[PDB]
A paper describes a structure:
As part of an effort to understand the structure of [name], we have determined the crystal structure of the tandem WD domain of [name], the first structure of a [name] component. The crystal contains one molecule of [name], but no Utp18 molecule, in the asymmetric unit. Residues 1–19, 327–337, 393–408 and 660–663 of [name] were not modeled due to missing electron density. The tandem WD domains of [name] fold into two 7-blade β-propellers, resembling an open clamshell. Blades 1–7 form the N-terminal WD1 domain, and blades 8–14 form the C-terminal WD2 domain. The two β-propellers of [name] are more open with an angle of ∼150° compared to those in Aip1 that have an angle of ∼110°. In addition to the core β-propeller domains, [name] possesses an extra loop (residues 657–684) following the last strand, 14C. The loop wraps around the side of blades 13 and 14 and inserts into the inter-domain space, making contacts with blade 1. We have found several highly conserved patches on the bottom face of each of the [name] WD domains that are potential binding sites for other molecules. In summary, structural mapping of the crosslinking data places the WD domains of Utp1 and Utp18 on two opposite sides of the [name] tandem WD domains.
Author numbering: 20 to 326, 338 to 392, 409 to 659, 664 to 684
């Protein structure tokens, strides 16, 4: 519908809080996470991205299970059966209820719904790849038990499904339909269940921090371990020889307990954010001393036990909150630098492996409010500058070692840093203060080189031409400053009619654009120091903007929930897109091929293909109402 941009894919998505599944991969295992309406499959021993489901489900995936080489994904009243990210079959349950839980075992598929029904599907022939024929519908009436919490199959329990509810534990024979067992009432609410590696035993977690070892055959407790003032969210048994139990909690802690020594081994504190559900799943890999953990904070971590407290091994993740600032890190379209209000700085790969890595800050730094990066001096010295909220100094980072750098750059006028910039050569860093000063630092030695004082209000933008001749600045005072870099002379001043909130400088054309509080975009020629164009159209605050690499276009985003393309030779809007999720950032790839956008909701970065590498006709309400790119692509 848009004439310029077509949705490509989304970067930086790992997990959303749905408990991940584990399956078999030849000799190794695979991990299935949820991203929303898409699942992703990783190798368990490398965390390499193996698959992503090729086609989005109509609604959000609620449950994931893996059985051999098949993934079962529940959404609405449906269960999708996938192999290699490709849907091989779709089960539509005869109900308007939603599927909540899944259990696949023997010739059976069991899917419980939110009205306490359990739909049972069966293989026609045992050598079928998956169950497909509806067999029966069980129901747990409120007298038989409480709300269904989990469906489990215990080892050697032929044709027998264990249905754990909030108040009790039931045993159904799914072949005959008979309820063969129902335990005594449990006093405290059951929240979690997990088959033990020995006969007849299932582990049950409660709302109170109790893990109960329950014997299904005799129908009695065998053991009850108390975890003080914790709410259990996951259980898993180690199975490599050591009789250990892991207990995840909603507060984000992972507790390791020795079943034989009856003592608390250890506790990994706050490995996942509590506000996102804490530990939503934690699983020991079968036969291995490795535990895989996840939460709703978009991370997937792996912990090992060396032949001793567990040691961090590897992990994959992205931001837990929407990205606040982004930038292309290089001209080969390899990495993107991305900052979020979760106080993290990440580098995301744009390539197929979807690799990513958080910038080491070696309790986090305050949230980033401005960002600049240049690839010129990578490996040689610091090449990233960040401004942080309410801090009077900018920090530096090293893109080579993915770690914070040596220098901090003070404003010198007791103001906060409100803008940062870098020379193309990578030799200089620029810092703009809330008190008006502009400071120029040496990226190699960290030394203060030069100081300018023109603005009397916050400097909201700074840049320097590719030849380091003329430096330009903007501020909330509505002033545009022009300075000689080699000396320190004020080359000129412009007074604009509204406060200026941001600047983007186009080095190959020496034009720079400014976002003003009057909702216009002002384009200025740095050589002539004159306004050459003014763009009017947006009906709300401008969030971001960028030049197309050639210099012909400017693309802008706004609170009005639009993304507009402006042709500079005419100053007219030649394309407009209406999104349902306001764009907070827009950046062109160094080469004109891609457009990166960040939005109010969503942890990732949207990639768009510029399919116009066009008419000059004006538009109005002919804007396209486009959706964001699919998480199922690539």
């Amino acid at each position: 519908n848009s004439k310029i941009f077509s949705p490509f894919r989304i970067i930086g998505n790992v997990s959303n809080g749905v408990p991940f599944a584990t399956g078999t991969l030849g000799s190794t295992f695979y991990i299935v996470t949820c991203v929303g309406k898409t699942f992703q499959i990783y190798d368990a021993n490398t965390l390499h991205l193996l698959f992503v489901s090729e086609k989005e489900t109509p609604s959000s995936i609620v449950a994931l299970s893996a059985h051999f080489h098949y993934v079962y994904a529940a959404y609405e009243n449906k269960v999708g059966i996938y192999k290699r990210g490709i849907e091989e079959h779709l089960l539509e349950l005869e109900t308007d209820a939603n599927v909540e839980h899944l259990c696949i075992f023997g010739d059976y598929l069991c899917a419980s719904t939110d009205d306490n029904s359990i739909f049972i599907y069966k293989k026609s022939d045992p050598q079928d790849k998956y169950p497909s024929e509806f067999y029966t519908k069980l129901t747990v009436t409120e007298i038989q038990g409480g709300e269904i919490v989990s469906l489990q199959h215990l080892a050697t329990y032929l044709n027998k499904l264990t249905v754990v509810t909030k108040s009790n534990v039931l045993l159904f024979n799914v072949r005959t339909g008979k309820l063969v067992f129902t335990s005594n009432e449990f006093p405290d609410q059951i929240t979690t269940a997990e088959p033990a590696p020995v006969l007849d035993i299932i582990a049950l977690g409660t709302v109170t921090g109790e893990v109960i070892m329950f014997n299904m055959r005799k129908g009695k407790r065998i053991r009850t371990i108390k975890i003080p003032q914790s709410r259990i969210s996951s259980l898993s048994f180690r199975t490599d020889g050591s009789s250990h139990l892991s207990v995840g909690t909603s507060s984000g802690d992972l507790i390791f307990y020795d079943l034989d020594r009856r003592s608390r081994i250890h506790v990994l504190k706050n490995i996942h954010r509590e506000s996102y559900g804490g530990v939503t799943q934690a699983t020991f890999l079968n036969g291995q001393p490795i535990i895989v953990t996840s939460g709703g904070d978009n991370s997937l971590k792996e912990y090992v036990f060396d032949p001793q407290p567990p040691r961090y091994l590897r992990s994959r993740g992205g931001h837990s909150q929407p990205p606040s600032y982004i930038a292309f890190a290089d001209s080969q379209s390899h990495f993107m630098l991305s900052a979020s209000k979760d106080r993290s700085l990440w580098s995301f790969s744009l390539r197929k492996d979807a690799q990513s890595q958080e910038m080491s800050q070696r309790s986090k730094f305050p949230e980033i409010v401005a960002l600049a990066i240049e690839n010129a001096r990578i490996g040689e010295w610091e090449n990233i500058i960040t401004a942080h909220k309410d801090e009077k100094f900018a920090r530096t980072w090293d893109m080579r070692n993915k770690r914070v750098g040596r220098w901090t750059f003070d404003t010198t006028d007791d103001g906060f840093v409100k803008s940062v910039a870098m020379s193309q050569c990578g030799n200089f860093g620029f810092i703009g203060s809330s008190n008006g000063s502009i400071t120029i630092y040496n990226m190699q030695s960290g030394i203060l080189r030069k100081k300018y004082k023109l603005h009397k209000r916050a400097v909201t933008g700074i840049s320097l031409d590719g030849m380091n001749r003329k430096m330009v600045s903007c501020g909330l005072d509505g002033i545009v400053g022009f300075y000689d870099f080699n000396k320190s002379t004020l080359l000129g001043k412009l007074k604009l009619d509204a406060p200026i909130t941001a600047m983007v400088y186009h080095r190959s054309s020496d034009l720079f654009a400014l976002a003003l509080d009057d909702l216009s975009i002002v384009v200025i020629d740095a050589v002539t120091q004159r306004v050459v164009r003014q763009l009017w159209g947006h009906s709300n605050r401008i969030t971001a903007f960028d030049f197309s690499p050639e210099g012909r276009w400017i693309v802008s985003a706004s609170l009005d929930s639009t993304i507009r393309t402006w042709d500079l030779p005419t100053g007219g809007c030649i394309d407009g897109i209406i999104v349902d999720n306001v764009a907070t950032n827009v950046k062109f790839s160094p080469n004109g091929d891609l457009l990166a956008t960040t939005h109010v909701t969503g942890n990732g970065i949207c990639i768009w293909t510029n399919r116009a590498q066009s008419t000059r006709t004006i538009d109005e309400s002919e804007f396209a109402r486009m959706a964001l790119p699919s998480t199922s692509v690539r």
